[PDB]
């Protein structure tokens, strides 16, 4: 596959995908750091809804793509997202969801033609 | 969603 064919296959799939953007910050940050991440998350929500034409879901368990406020390895064991992630990793036959950090999501969206 | 499509381009 070429990058052009890769982009078209993603776009066709994104029309049939539900995306969840989580509330939980994995670690202690300042008010300034949290505001910077939140502003980036809000821009990503708009790109997925308006440009990629995905459905925004409020339930991370009813989503194909999960956008995180950090890396999955950074979330505590007691965290609901971390528990669900661990439960999915153990089941080979389970329905697969992607867990993307907000940095990985920014790079993906830029590779789709929406540079942010 | 299927695991075959990569997040990173070819
Ligand atoms: Cl990140
Ligand atoms: Cl990254």
Resolution of the structure in the document, Å = 2.2
Tally of residues, chain A:
116
Whether residues B10 and A2 touch (CB distance < 8 A) is answered with: yes
Q: How was this structure determined?
A: X-ray
Shortest Cα distance from A11 to chain B (angstroms)? 11
Q: CB-based burial of residue A112 (10 Å sphere; 0-12 exposed, 13-18 middle, 19+ buried)?
A: middle
Q: Is A66 helix (H, G, I), strand (E, B) or coil?
A: strand
- Of B2, B1, B3, B7, nearest to A6 by C-alpha is B7
Count CA atoms closer than 13 A to A65's CA, side-chain side.
Answer: 28
Q: Which ligand is nearest to the CA of A25?
A: 1
Shortest Cα distance from A94 to chain B (angstroms)? 11
In chain A, where the domains are located: 1-116
């Amino acid at each position: 596959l070429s990058k052009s064919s890769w982009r078209q296959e993603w776009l066709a799939n994104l029309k049939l995908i539900s995306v969840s953007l989580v509330d939980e910050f994995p670690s202690e940050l300042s008010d300034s750091d949290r505001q910077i991440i939140n502003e980036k998350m809000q821009l990503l929500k708009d790109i997925f809804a308006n440009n990629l034409k995905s459905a925004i879901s409020n339930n991370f368990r009813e989503s194909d793509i999960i956008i995180l406020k950090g890396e999955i390895e950074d979330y505590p064991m007691s965290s609901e997202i971390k528990i669900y992630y661990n439960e999915l990793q153990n089941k080979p036959d389970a329905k697969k969801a992607r867990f993307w950090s907000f940095m990985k999501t920014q790079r993906f969206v830029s590779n789709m033609g929406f540079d942010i | 969603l299927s695991t075959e499509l990569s997040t990173e381009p070819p």
